[PDB]
Each structure stands twice: as C-alpha cells, then as structure tokens.
mmCIF file of C-alpha atoms and ligand atoms in Angstrom:
data_model
loop_
_atom_site.group_PDB
_atom_site.id
_atom_site.type_symbol
_atom_site.label_atom_id
_atom_site.label_comp_id
_atom_site.label_asym_id
_atom_site.label_seq_id
_atom_site.Cartn_x
_atom_site.Cartn_y
_atom_site.Cartn_z
ATOM 1 C CA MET A 1 0.781 -25.331 -22.412
ATOM 2 C CA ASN A 2 -0.788 -23.895 -19.246
ATOM 3 C CA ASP A 3 -3.770 -22.784 -21.305
ATOM 4 C CA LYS A 4 -6.210 -22.820 -18.388
ATOM 5 C CA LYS A 5 -3.843 -20.865 -16.154
ATOM 6 C CA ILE A 6 -3.172 -18.216 -18.824
ATOM 7 C CA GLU A 7 -6.903 -17.832 -19.501
ATOM 8 C CA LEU A 8 -7.695 -17.262 -15.813
ATOM 9 C CA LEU A 9 -4.716 -14.949 -15.293
ATOM 10 C CA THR A 10 -5.734 -12.844 -18.280
ATOM 11 C CA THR A 11 -9.388 -12.553 -17.242
ATOM 12 C CA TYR A 12 -8.385 -12.021 -13.611
ATOM 13 C CA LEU A 13 -5.925 -9.235 -14.392
ATOM 14 C CA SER A 14 -8.413 -7.500 -16.714
ATOM 15 C CA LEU A 15 -10.482 -6.736 -13.595
ATOM 16 C CA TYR A 16 -7.905 -4.247 -12.311
ATOM 17 C CA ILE A 17 -6.466 -0.832 -13.075
ATOM 18 C CA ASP A 18 -2.904 0.116 -12.031
ATOM 19 C CA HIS A 19 -2.536 2.611 -9.185
ATOM 20 C CA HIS A 20 -0.070 4.652 -11.250
ATOM 21 C CA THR A 21 -2.834 5.489 -13.727
ATOM 22 C CA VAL A 22 -5.192 6.474 -10.917
ATOM 23 C CA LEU A 23 -2.427 8.577 -9.293
ATOM 24 C CA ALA A 24 -1.721 10.521 -12.510
ATOM 25 C CA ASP A 25 -5.419 11.323 -12.996
ATOM 26 C CA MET A 26 -5.613 13.147 -9.672
ATOM 27 C CA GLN A 27 -2.246 14.898 -10.018
ATOM 28 C CA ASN A 28 -3.272 16.122 -13.479
ATOM 29 C CA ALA A 29 -6.927 16.691 -12.554
ATOM 30 C CA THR A 30 -7.874 14.962 -15.800
ATOM 31 C CA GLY A 31 -11.201 13.786 -14.412
ATOM 32 C CA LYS A 32 -10.722 10.269 -15.784
ATOM 33 C CA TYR A 33 -11.781 8.216 -12.768
ATOM 34 C CA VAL A 34 -14.131 8.351 -9.785
ATOM 35 C CA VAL A 35 -12.618 6.451 -6.875
ATOM 36 C CA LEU A 36 -15.074 4.537 -4.678
ATOM 37 C CA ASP A 37 -14.167 3.218 -1.216
ATOM 38 C CA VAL A 38 -16.510 0.205 -0.943
ATOM 39 C CA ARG A 39 -15.629 -1.019 2.551
ATOM 40 C CA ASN A 40 -18.603 -1.777 4.799
ATOM 41 C CA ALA A 41 -16.810 -0.976 8.054
ATOM 42 C CA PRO A 42 -17.869 2.141 10.001
ATOM 43 C CA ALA A 43 -16.007 5.440 9.498
ATOM 44 C CA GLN A 44 -14.512 5.020 12.985
ATOM 45 C CA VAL A 45 -12.957 1.739 11.830
ATOM 46 C CA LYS A 46 -11.891 2.840 8.358
ATOM 47 C CA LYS A 47 -9.996 5.827 9.805
ATOM 48 C CA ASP A 48 -8.589 7.100 6.514
ATOM 49 C CA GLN A 49 -9.382 6.736 2.819
ATOM 50 C CA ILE A 50 -7.794 7.380 -0.560
ATOM 51 C CA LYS A 51 -7.585 11.107 -1.307
ATOM 52 C CA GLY A 52 -10.695 12.264 -3.160
ATOM 53 C CA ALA A 53 -12.436 8.918 -2.765
ATOM 54 C CA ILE A 54 -16.182 8.597 -2.302
ATOM 55 C CA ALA A 55 -17.529 6.358 0.447
ATOM 56 C CA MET A 56 -19.807 3.917 -1.323
ATOM 57 C CA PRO A 57 -20.233 0.808 0.881
ATOM 58 C CA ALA A 58 -20.630 -2.377 -1.131
ATOM 59 C CA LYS A 59 -23.754 -3.153 0.899
ATOM 60 C CA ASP A 60 -25.489 0.078 -0.194
ATOM 61 C CA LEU A 61 -24.195 0.323 -3.765
ATOM 62 C CA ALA A 62 -27.345 -1.273 -5.238
ATOM 63 C CA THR A 63 -29.568 1.224 -3.410
ATOM 64 C CA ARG A 64 -27.381 4.274 -4.123
ATOM 65 C CA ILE A 65 -26.571 3.271 -7.706
ATOM 66 C CA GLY A 66 -28.773 6.079 -9.014
ATOM 67 C CA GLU A 67 -26.156 8.461 -7.612
ATOM 68 C CA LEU A 68 -23.494 7.304 -10.070
ATOM 69 C CA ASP A 69 -23.059 8.715 -13.556
ATOM 70 C CA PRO A 70 -23.190 6.064 -16.353
ATOM 71 C CA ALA A 71 -20.787 8.076 -18.521
ATOM 72 C CA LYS A 72 -17.958 7.961 -16.013
ATOM 73 C CA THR A 73 -15.416 5.287 -15.131
ATOM 74 C CA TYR A 74 -15.382 3.910 -11.591
ATOM 75 C CA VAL A 75 -12.464 2.462 -9.614
ATOM 76 C CA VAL A 76 -13.351 0.469 -6.479
ATOM 77 C CA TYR A 77 -11.028 -0.482 -3.642
ATOM 78 C CA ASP A 78 -11.247 -2.400 -0.381
ATOM 79 C CA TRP A 79 -8.817 -3.039 2.487
ATOM 80 C CA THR A 80 -6.524 -5.481 0.671
ATOM 81 C CA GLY A 81 -6.265 -7.562 -2.473
ATOM 82 C CA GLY A 82 -7.595 -10.489 -0.451
ATOM 83 C CA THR A 83 -10.788 -8.821 0.755
ATOM 84 C CA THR A 84 -13.847 -9.482 -1.423
ATOM 85 C CA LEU A 85 -15.818 -6.234 -1.197
ATOM 86 C CA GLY A 86 -13.802 -4.849 -4.100
ATOM 87 C CA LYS A 87 -14.869 -7.740 -6.316
ATOM 88 C CA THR A 88 -18.440 -7.642 -4.960
ATOM 89 C CA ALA A 89 -18.834 -3.944 -5.882
ATOM 90 C CA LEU A 90 -17.147 -4.510 -9.233
ATOM 91 C CA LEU A 91 -19.614 -7.308 -10.042
ATOM 92 C CA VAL A 92 -22.596 -5.098 -9.185
ATOM 93 C CA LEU A 93 -21.279 -2.246 -11.361
ATOM 94 C CA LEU A 94 -20.273 -4.398 -14.329
ATOM 95 C CA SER A 95 -23.614 -6.215 -14.048
ATOM 96 C CA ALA A 96 -25.393 -2.845 -14.094
ATOM 97 C CA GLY A 97 -23.608 -1.845 -17.291
ATOM 98 C CA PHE A 98 -21.174 0.577 -15.643
ATOM 99 C CA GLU A 99 -17.532 0.829 -16.671
ATOM 100 C CA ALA A 100 -15.520 -0.112 -13.588
ATOM 101 C CA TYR A 101 -12.248 -1.606 -12.390
ATOM 102 C CA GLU A 102 -10.794 -2.688 -9.039
ATOM 103 C CA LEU A 103 -7.694 -0.858 -7.699
ATOM 104 C CA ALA A 104 -4.744 -3.245 -7.999
ATOM 105 C CA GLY A 105 -3.131 -3.466 -4.561
ATOM 106 C CA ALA A 106 -6.196 -2.020 -2.817
ATOM 107 C CA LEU A 107 -5.856 0.373 0.125
ATOM 108 C CA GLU A 108 -2.988 -1.708 1.575
ATOM 109 C CA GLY A 109 -0.907 -1.209 -1.556
ATOM 110 C CA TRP A 110 -1.726 2.492 -1.726
ATOM 111 C CA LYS A 111 -0.581 3.013 1.875
ATOM 112 C CA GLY A 112 2.446 0.824 1.264
ATOM 113 C CA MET A 113 3.555 3.118 -1.565
ATOM 114 C CA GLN A 114 2.946 6.100 0.735
ATOM 115 C CA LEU A 115 0.312 7.542 -1.612
ATOM 116 C CA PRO A 116 -2.192 10.352 -0.744
ATOM 117 C CA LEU A 117 -4.797 9.710 1.923
ATOM 118 C CA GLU A 118 -7.371 11.752 3.816
ATOM 119 C CA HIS A 119 -9.418 11.434 6.989
ATOM 120 C CA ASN B 2 -20.869 -27.318 -8.052
ATOM 121 C CA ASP B 3 -18.370 -28.189 -10.788
ATOM 122 C CA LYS B 4 -17.731 -24.543 -11.614
ATOM 123 C CA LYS B 5 -16.470 -23.790 -8.093
ATOM 124 C CA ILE B 6 -14.117 -26.771 -7.983
ATOM 125 C CA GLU B 7 -13.006 -25.919 -11.498
ATOM 126 C CA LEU B 8 -12.040 -22.376 -10.440
ATOM 127 C CA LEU B 9 -10.402 -23.493 -7.183
ATOM 128 C CA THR B 10 -8.299 -26.075 -9.024
ATOM 129 C CA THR B 11 -7.044 -23.618 -11.633
ATOM 130 C CA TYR B 12 -6.523 -20.749 -9.179
ATOM 131 C CA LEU B 13 -4.541 -22.944 -6.771
ATOM 132 C CA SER B 14 -2.464 -24.352 -9.651
ATOM 133 C CA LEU B 15 -0.990 -20.848 -9.911
ATOM 134 C CA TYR B 16 0.623 -21.079 -6.476
ATOM 135 C CA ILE B 17 3.356 -23.085 -4.789
ATOM 136 C CA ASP B 18 3.545 -23.826 -1.057
ATOM 137 C CA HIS B 19 6.372 -22.299 0.973
ATOM 138 C CA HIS B 20 7.026 -25.775 2.409
ATOM 139 C CA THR B 21 7.799 -27.079 -1.078
ATOM 140 C CA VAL B 22 10.118 -24.144 -1.782
ATOM 141 C CA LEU B 23 11.808 -24.435 1.603
ATOM 142 C CA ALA B 24 12.405 -28.191 1.361
ATOM 143 C CA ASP B 25 13.948 -27.726 -2.083
ATOM 144 C CA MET B 26 16.424 -25.056 -0.937
ATOM 145 C CA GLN B 27 17.530 -27.183 2.022
ATOM 146 C CA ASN B 28 17.908 -30.490 0.183
ATOM 147 C CA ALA B 29 19.939 -28.884 -2.617
ATOM 148 C CA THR B 30 17.460 -30.308 -5.119
ATOM 149 C CA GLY B 31 17.830 -27.167 -7.218
ATOM 150 C CA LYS B 32 14.381 -27.508 -8.741
ATOM 151 C CA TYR B 33 13.174 -23.952 -8.063
ATOM 152 C CA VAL B 34 14.577 -20.464 -8.691
ATOM 153 C CA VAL B 35 12.973 -17.682 -6.649
ATOM 154 C CA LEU B 36 12.428 -14.283 -8.317
ATOM 155 C CA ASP B 37 11.855 -11.178 -6.202
ATOM 156 C CA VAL B 38 9.615 -9.087 -8.466
ATOM 157 C CA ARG B 39 9.193 -6.160 -6.050
ATOM 158 C CA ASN B 40 9.959 -2.636 -7.302
ATOM 159 C CA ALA B 41 13.636 -1.622 -7.304
ATOM 160 C CA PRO B 42 13.434 0.862 -4.387
ATOM 161 C CA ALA B 43 12.012 -1.782 -2.046
ATOM 162 C CA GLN B 44 14.777 -4.243 -2.913
ATOM 163 C CA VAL B 45 17.416 -1.801 -1.634
ATOM 164 C CA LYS B 46 16.683 -3.001 1.923
ATOM 165 C CA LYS B 47 18.210 -6.310 0.839
ATOM 166 C CA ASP B 48 15.547 -8.318 2.697
ATOM 167 C CA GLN B 49 14.944 -10.829 -0.085
ATOM 168 C CA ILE B 50 14.351 -14.547 0.356
ATOM 169 C CA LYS B 51 17.549 -16.619 0.487
ATOM 170 C CA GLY B 52 18.897 -17.150 -3.028
ATOM 171 C CA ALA B 53 16.217 -14.947 -4.588
ATOM 172 C CA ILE B 54 17.078 -13.105 -7.781
ATOM 173 C CA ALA B 55 16.208 -9.398 -7.797
ATOM 174 C CA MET B 56 13.971 -8.932 -10.824
ATOM 175 C CA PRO B 57 11.539 -5.968 -10.668
ATOM 176 C CA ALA B 58 8.213 -6.812 -12.279
ATOM 177 C CA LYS B 59 8.538 -3.943 -14.786
ATOM 178 C CA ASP B 60 11.811 -5.418 -16.042
ATOM 179 C CA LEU B 61 10.827 -9.087 -16.124
ATOM 180 C CA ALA B 62 9.734 -9.299 -19.779
ATOM 181 C CA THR B 63 13.024 -7.602 -20.682
ATOM 182 C CA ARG B 64 15.342 -9.789 -18.569
ATOM 183 C CA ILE B 65 13.481 -13.054 -19.071
ATOM 184 C CA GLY B 66 16.118 -14.044 -21.620
ATOM 185 C CA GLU B 67 18.664 -14.616 -18.852
ATOM 186 C CA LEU B 68 16.617 -17.417 -17.305
ATOM 187 C CA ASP B 69 17.289 -21.151 -17.580
ATOM 188 C CA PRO B 70 14.299 -22.849 -19.306
ATOM 189 C CA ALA B 71 14.874 -26.100 -17.398
ATOM 190 C CA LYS B 72 14.193 -24.406 -14.053
ATOM 191 C CA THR B 73 10.864 -23.702 -12.363
ATOM 192 C CA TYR B 74 10.432 -20.102 -11.253
ATOM 193 C CA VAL B 75 8.651 -18.838 -8.147
ATOM 194 C CA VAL B 76 7.748 -15.145 -8.069
ATOM 195 C CA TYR B 77 6.736 -12.953 -5.121
ATOM 196 C CA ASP B 78 5.927 -9.350 -4.253
ATOM 197 C CA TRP B 79 5.994 -7.848 -0.772
ATOM 198 C CA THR B 80 2.466 -9.063 -0.126
ATOM 199 C CA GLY B 81 0.007 -11.451 -1.739
ATOM 200 C CA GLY B 82 -2.661 -8.772 -2.079
ATOM 201 C CA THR B 83 -1.035 -7.129 -5.104
ATOM 202 C CA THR B 84 -1.292 -8.251 -8.720
ATOM 203 C CA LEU B 85 2.450 -8.063 -9.450
ATOM 204 C CA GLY B 86 2.843 -11.776 -8.831
ATOM 205 C CA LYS B 87 0.136 -12.758 -11.294
ATOM 206 C CA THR B 88 1.353 -10.292 -13.903
ATOM 207 C CA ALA B 89 4.874 -11.737 -13.681
ATOM 208 C CA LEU B 90 3.422 -15.261 -13.727
ATOM 209 C CA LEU B 91 1.478 -14.469 -16.914
ATOM 210 C CA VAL B 92 4.654 -13.269 -18.618
ATOM 211 C CA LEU B 93 6.564 -16.425 -17.643
ATOM 212 C CA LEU B 94 3.790 -18.878 -18.545
ATOM 213 C CA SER B 95 3.120 -17.052 -21.849
ATOM 214 C CA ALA B 96 6.821 -17.398 -22.691
ATOM 215 C CA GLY B 97 6.677 -21.166 -22.253
ATOM 216 C CA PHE B 98 8.184 -21.243 -18.762
ATOM 217 C CA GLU B 99 7.053 -23.262 -15.771
ATOM 218 C CA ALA B 100 6.312 -20.900 -12.881
ATOM 219 C CA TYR B 101 4.234 -20.329 -9.767
ATOM 220 C CA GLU B 102 3.547 -17.489 -7.359
ATOM 221 C CA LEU B 103 4.793 -18.007 -3.772
ATOM 222 C CA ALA B 104 1.807 -18.454 -1.418
ATOM 223 C CA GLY B 105 2.025 -15.874 1.365
ATOM 224 C CA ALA B 106 4.545 -13.735 -0.529
ATOM 225 C CA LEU B 107 7.400 -11.988 1.314
ATOM 226 C CA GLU B 108 5.228 -10.898 4.239
ATOM 227 C CA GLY B 109 4.138 -14.482 4.871
ATOM 228 C CA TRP B 110 7.657 -15.858 4.407
ATOM 229 C CA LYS B 111 9.070 -13.448 6.996
ATOM 230 C CA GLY B 112 6.036 -14.089 9.179
ATOM 231 C CA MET B 113 7.186 -17.692 9.399
ATOM 232 C CA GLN B 114 10.763 -16.579 10.014
ATOM 233 C CA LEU B 115 11.893 -18.465 6.919
ATOM 234 C CA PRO B 116 15.418 -18.016 5.464
ATOM 235 C CA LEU B 117 16.383 -14.623 4.060
ATOM 236 C CA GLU B 118 19.533 -13.942 2.036
ATOM 237 C CA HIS B 119 21.023 -11.594 4.641
ATOM 238 C CA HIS B 120 20.894 -12.786 8.231
ATOM 239 C CA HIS B 121 22.555 -12.092 11.576
ATOM 240 C CA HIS B 122 26.225 -13.153 11.739
ATOM 241 C CA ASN C 2 -17.551 -8.036 -19.727
ATOM 242 C CA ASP C 3 -19.076 -11.531 -19.968
ATOM 243 C CA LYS C 4 -15.838 -13.264 -18.937
ATOM 244 C CA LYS C 5 -15.299 -10.804 -16.088
ATOM 245 C CA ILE C 6 -18.863 -11.219 -14.813
ATOM 246 C CA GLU C 7 -18.532 -15.007 -15.050
ATOM 247 C CA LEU C 8 -15.257 -15.131 -13.103
ATOM 248 C CA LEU C 9 -16.480 -12.699 -10.463
ATOM 249 C CA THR C 10 -19.733 -14.678 -10.072
ATOM 250 C CA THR C 11 -17.985 -18.007 -9.521
ATOM 251 C CA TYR C 12 -15.228 -16.470 -7.420
ATOM 252 C CA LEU C 13 -17.652 -14.729 -5.041
ATOM 253 C CA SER C 14 -19.846 -17.852 -4.715
ATOM 254 C CA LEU C 15 -16.922 -19.354 -2.794
ATOM 255 C CA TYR C 16 -17.554 -16.898 0.054
ATOM 256 C CA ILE C 17 -20.193 -16.226 2.713
ATOM 257 C CA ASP C 18 -21.071 -12.990 4.531
ATOM 258 C CA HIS C 19 -19.706 -12.716 8.075
ATOM 259 C CA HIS C 20 -23.037 -11.195 9.075
ATOM 260 C CA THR C 21 -24.900 -14.367 8.147
ATOM 261 C CA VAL C 22 -22.372 -16.513 10.011
ATOM 262 C CA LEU C 23 -22.206 -14.333 13.112
ATOM 263 C CA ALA C 24 -25.985 -14.149 13.439
ATOM 264 C CA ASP C 25 -26.190 -17.942 13.240
ATOM 265 C CA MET C 26 -23.657 -18.267 16.063
ATOM 266 C CA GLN C 27 -26.101 -16.254 18.189
ATOM 267 C CA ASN C 28 -29.448 -17.297 16.688
ATOM 268 C CA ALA C 29 -29.034 -20.612 18.510
ATOM 269 C CA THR C 30 -29.567 -22.264 15.122
ATOM 270 C CA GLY C 31 -26.021 -23.555 14.902
ATOM 271 C CA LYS C 32 -26.017 -24.614 11.253
ATOM 272 C CA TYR C 33 -22.642 -23.005 10.529
ATOM 273 C CA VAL C 34 -19.353 -24.340 11.870
ATOM 274 C CA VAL C 35 -16.211 -22.230 11.611
ATOM 275 C CA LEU C 36 -12.898 -23.936 10.896
ATOM 276 C CA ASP C 37 -9.578 -22.232 11.647
ATOM 277 C CA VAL C 38 -7.348 -23.797 9.016
ATOM 278 C CA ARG C 39 -4.031 -22.150 9.876
ATOM 279 C CA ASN C 40 -1.009 -24.462 9.616
ATOM 280 C CA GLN C 49 -8.695 -16.260 16.977
ATOM 281 C CA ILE C 50 -12.456 -16.730 16.662
ATOM 282 C CA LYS C 51 -14.103 -18.116 19.795
ATOM 283 C CA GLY C 52 -16.117 -21.224 19.015
ATOM 284 C CA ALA C 53 -14.058 -22.050 15.930
ATOM 285 C CA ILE C 54 -12.702 -25.576 15.495
ATOM 286 C CA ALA C 55 -8.944 -25.719 14.915
ATOM 287 C CA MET C 56 -8.369 -27.945 11.882
ATOM 288 C CA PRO C 57 -5.224 -27.329 9.773
ATOM 289 C CA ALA C 58 -5.797 -27.327 6.012
ATOM 290 C CA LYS C 59 -3.032 -29.934 5.687
ATOM 291 C CA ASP C 60 -4.801 -32.322 8.066
ATOM 292 C CA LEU C 61 -8.276 -31.512 6.769
ATOM 293 C CA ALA C 62 -7.802 -34.153 4.071
ATOM 294 C CA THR C 63 -7.770 -36.705 6.887
ATOM 295 C CA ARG C 64 -9.833 -35.301 9.754
ATOM 296 C CA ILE C 65 -12.675 -34.170 7.504
ATOM 297 C CA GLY C 66 -14.295 -37.469 8.453
ATOM 298 C CA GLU C 67 -14.952 -35.893 11.840
ATOM 299 C CA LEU C 68 -17.432 -33.418 10.360
ATOM 300 C CA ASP C 69 -21.222 -33.443 10.588
ATOM 301 C CA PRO C 70 -22.655 -33.292 7.012
ATOM 302 C CA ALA C 71 -25.745 -31.526 8.348
ATOM 303 C CA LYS C 72 -23.565 -28.489 9.057
ATOM 304 C CA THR C 73 -22.220 -25.843 6.672
ATOM 305 C CA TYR C 74 -18.500 -25.258 7.204
ATOM 306 C CA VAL C 75 -16.924 -21.814 7.042
ATOM 307 C CA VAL C 76 -13.172 -21.726 6.552
ATOM 308 C CA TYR C 77 -11.400 -18.832 8.237
ATOM 309 C CA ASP C 78 -7.990 -17.632 7.038
ATOM 310 C CA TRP C 79 -6.491 -15.473 9.798
ATOM 311 C CA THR C 80 -3.670 -14.297 7.515
ATOM 312 C CA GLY C 81 -6.361 -12.811 5.290
ATOM 313 C CA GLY C 82 -4.784 -14.553 2.319
ATOM 314 C CA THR C 83 -6.450 -16.059 -0.741
ATOM 315 C CA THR C 84 -4.979 -19.576 -0.887
ATOM 316 C CA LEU C 85 -5.153 -21.176 2.569
ATOM 317 C CA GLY C 86 -8.933 -20.997 2.727
ATOM 318 C CA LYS C 87 -9.210 -22.127 -0.880
ATOM 319 C CA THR C 88 -7.064 -25.199 -0.224
ATOM 320 C CA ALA C 89 -9.436 -26.178 2.578
ATOM 321 C CA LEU C 90 -12.521 -25.309 0.518
ATOM 322 C CA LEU C 91 -11.357 -27.508 -2.368
ATOM 323 C CA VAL C 92 -11.044 -30.480 -0.038
ATOM 324 C CA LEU C 93 -14.439 -29.878 1.593
ATOM 325 C CA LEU C 94 -16.390 -29.309 -1.626
ATOM 326 C CA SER C 95 -14.758 -32.261 -3.364
ATOM 327 C CA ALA C 96 -15.896 -34.395 -0.399
ATOM 328 C CA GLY C 97 -19.522 -33.352 -0.949
ATOM 329 C CA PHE C 98 -19.599 -30.919 1.943
ATOM 330 C CA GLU C 99 -21.292 -27.551 1.803
ATOM 331 C CA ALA C 100 -18.660 -24.949 2.644
ATOM 332 C CA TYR C 101 -17.688 -21.319 2.116
ATOM 333 C CA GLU C 102 -14.773 -19.066 3.054
ATOM 334 C CA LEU C 103 -15.468 -16.332 5.610
ATOM 335 C CA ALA C 104 -15.302 -12.930 3.928
HETATM 336 BR BR1 BR D 1 -15.238 -3.901 5.439
#
C-alpha cells in the first residue's frame, strides 16, 4: 500500500539533516559539521547567512572542491526548501564521494525559527 | 523521458490541491481531516486552517492512535519549504493511513485568504 | 548513496538554469518560451496550470517551454511540467 510513495519519501528525506542537530554542533563546538551557503546570488543580495557558514556558490563548487576536506561532513543550504541550489550542490558532493546533507528548512526555516545569523 | 514523468507522478501523488480540500469543507462531504503539524509554540497564535487538528509533528507518531482510519488526512507546516509535511506523511502512510500534504501549506492557504478557524466576528 | 544520487539526478533534470533562459530572451534566438502557470516576468505567456491541459494545443512544438512558479513552490510548476512532458513537449521548470 503506497509503496512507491513511501520509497520516494524515504529516499527524499534521507537527503536532509535536521536543523536542531546543526544548531547543537555550533553551541557545543563539537566540530561535527561544516555549513556551506551554496546560493549563487551576490553578497549584496544574500545580505545575511547562517552563523559560521562558508560561502560556497553552487556554480563554483566543482572548481573549489579541492578546498573541502574529505574527512568532514558538509551541510548545504539555499534560500528555501523549494530552491534547487541545495540539491545541486548536494549532488555534486555526493557524486564526488563527500559526505553531505541538505539543511531541512533551508535559510527560510532557520530565519523563521529565529536562529543565529551573521552579515 | 519516462524517468521524469515517473518521478513527477509519484511526487505529485503526495500532495492534495487546496481546491479539493476547500470544496470538501464547504460541501460537508467530510472526506478529509486537516492536521496542523507545526511546532507547539507556533500553534499558540491560533491561526490554523478551519477545522484543523493541532498535532505537532514530533507528537504525531504518538497520537496517531486517536485518528479515524476511514478518514483521509491532510498535513501542513507553516510553509511548503520544510520537510515536516513529508515526515508526517511518511508516518501516516507507513501506518496504513491514506494521507496527503497540503499544496502551498499554511502560507499559501492564508495567501489565498482561505478559511481559518478563528476569524473576525 | 546510489538512491540519493539517482533521485537528485532525475529531480534536477526537471529544471533549467535561469541564466540559459535569460540569455536566450536576449540572444534573439527565441527558442525558450516562459509560461506563468499561476492559478511577473515580462514576455512570459500567462497560462494557468489548470487550463494548460486544454490550451497546450496553442503551443509551438519547436519551442522549449519553461514553467515559472511565482510562489516559488514545488508543485505548481510540476503539475504543468507533467502535462507538457506527457504531451511530448520539451519543457523545464525555471530554477
Ligand atoms: Br541564488
């Protein structure tokens, strides 16, 4: 019953990591995740970003991939859950053999929960 | 491309149109039960969809035993961009229930000025 | 990660870069046609996703259609895409 739906939902959800987990890593300084802001918009358009995030535009990821450490775990995020740069960056990383996840809720969710940002 | 159409068909089968939900709540068909799966704090503003049952996503699996199996459930979070709707949907479908996520979520519903439980008197 | 890579690959194939579309709207090539399927982008043809399954016969097959979802959702564009692709049309959703 609803086998196809369940299969897609399970694979789909496995792409993400909960913001609570990301939040605890920074508040405990456990060094578990490296947060990448993969939006392609200019800095003047982005305005703010998740606290401690690294600007790694999806369009340059391939070229700057050598900058990332293979032994770490990456979390990518875009404007919203509907934008596709999060998934695009995730695909590049997973395809490259990197351990990565997309931030559930994206930047929109983070801001909605009044979580830490920076300019 | 069969793979594209295949994905689109399955992905869309997860959602239900607001028009379908609206028509049902105005014709008294009683075919759908709306579940507000937003986090508890957000639901304090009492801005839920008309007739929606307050059921925080993190409590769904626990309170799913209070639901009528003959009804079709429609879940929604404050916005469609989150994964709370799909996570709730997975719980319901895995339990043998018929459910769908509301297209547009709460933001979209309000955006269309659709019926909310509490309104001007 | 095979299942993840597979899903992501098919999912992303549904979309087209705004850069490619924009350039075409200036390149004087005019091979892309933008459809606003809301039930604004200048030059876009207003065609509701609900009426698409009836007006789609007013489309030139030699053109690639790009569905634009103003609300930035993930279902409106897909509804329109499903209709267009099933009809044999080449189409993508504007990312
Ligand atoms: Br962007």
